[PDB]
Design a protein around this ligand. Sequence first.
Ligand SMILES: [Ca+2]
Ligand SMILES: [Fe+3]
Ligand SMILES: [Zn+2]
Length: 329
Amino acid sequence: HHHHHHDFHVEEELDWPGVYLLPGQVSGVALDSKNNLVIFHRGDHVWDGNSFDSKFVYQQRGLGPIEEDTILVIDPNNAEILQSSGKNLFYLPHGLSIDTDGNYWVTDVALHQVFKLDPHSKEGPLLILGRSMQPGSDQNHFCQPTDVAVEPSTGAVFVSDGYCNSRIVQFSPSGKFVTQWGEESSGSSPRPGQFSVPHSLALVPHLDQLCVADRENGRIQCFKTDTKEFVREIKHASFGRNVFAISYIPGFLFAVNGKPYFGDQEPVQGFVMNFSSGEIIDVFKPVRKHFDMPHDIVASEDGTVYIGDAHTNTVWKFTLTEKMEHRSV
Ligand SMILES: [Ca+2]
Ligand SMILES: [Fe+3]
Ligand SMILES: [Zn+2]
């Protein structure tokens, strides 16, 4: 604020070779305890108009599951693939997050399910939530579930359930339904506690909060994690129509929006917000390749930010910095 604008800026790390990877649609990103990037991709499977019918049931079961490894851990420096798994399990990968023990938490929009996986196991999922290929809206069904966040202090499993639902569901560490909140965003304006496609979750550990990217409303909703009380709404004209994904590190909320329609004024970008005020302090995009559907984002306390694209099938590494003078502008 000494010069006209703001001093924090996010910039692509150009010496990171992970941009040269050729995965399928990249649906989820996360960081493991060694700060390695972990991605969740769709191989040769694509989400299109012939994937689901009118009742949200998956059409291409006979093509089988994705045959190639679907989860990759990627070195933060040389971008080499350190390990891979997720072979012969998934149909349309979506969310990926990692709990405090290092377990993977994954969602599938075709299966309508949520998986807990031990990364160092050879004997299949530790937990499966929801019913295979069966979309629903009760305590034991999902409808195209989008993301999962697991609270390190309680072990509470939160699932954002809604490309066709409008809820967040709490589960016990043993997979048992605890509680749920949220409903479809009502007539005229959308009111607090109402989702239209809860698409991304970020926990705020020491403020006991949970943040939700409401993609169709173009906004973020924050809730108190114990009481479920609506804390706050973040909405900016810069987002445009969508907020696809969010990530928290102390001090900052990071977000990606959606691609503009023809005529739209708001480009596709990463966003950096001051977490307290909720205000956008920085806007960014890659130098190599381009955003089309940036779909998930994960930030590290060390200042690293990763983004995966579900259309250009790419992951980028970025770095948050504060500089005395702005190299650009
Ligand atoms: Ca994620
Ligand atoms: Fe300044
Ligand atoms: Zn999605």
